[PDB]
């Protein structure tokens, strides 16, 4: 269970990184809407990761 939690935590970190890449891509794109979605996802994930 701990390993699964660690894997989930690792996945969350990877997911956050993917979201960050999208946010970086959005800045290059110049579209404000794409950037907004990425930011919301990062905050909830970080809180979940800390709890885990």
């Amino acid at each position: 269970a701990q390993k699964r939690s660690e894997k989930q935590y690792n996945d969350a970190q990877n997911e956050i990184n993917k979201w960050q890449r999208n946010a970086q891509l959005a800045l290059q794109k110049g579209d404000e809407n794409l950037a907004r979605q990425a930011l919301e996802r990062k905050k909830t994930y970080t809180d979940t990761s800390a709890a885990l």
Partner: peptide, 12 residues
């Protein structure tokens, strides 16, 4: 705030 941050990043 995020939009403002994005705008700041955009200018360079």
């Amino acid at each position: 705030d995020e939009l403002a941050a994005l705008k700041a990043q955009m200018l360079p």
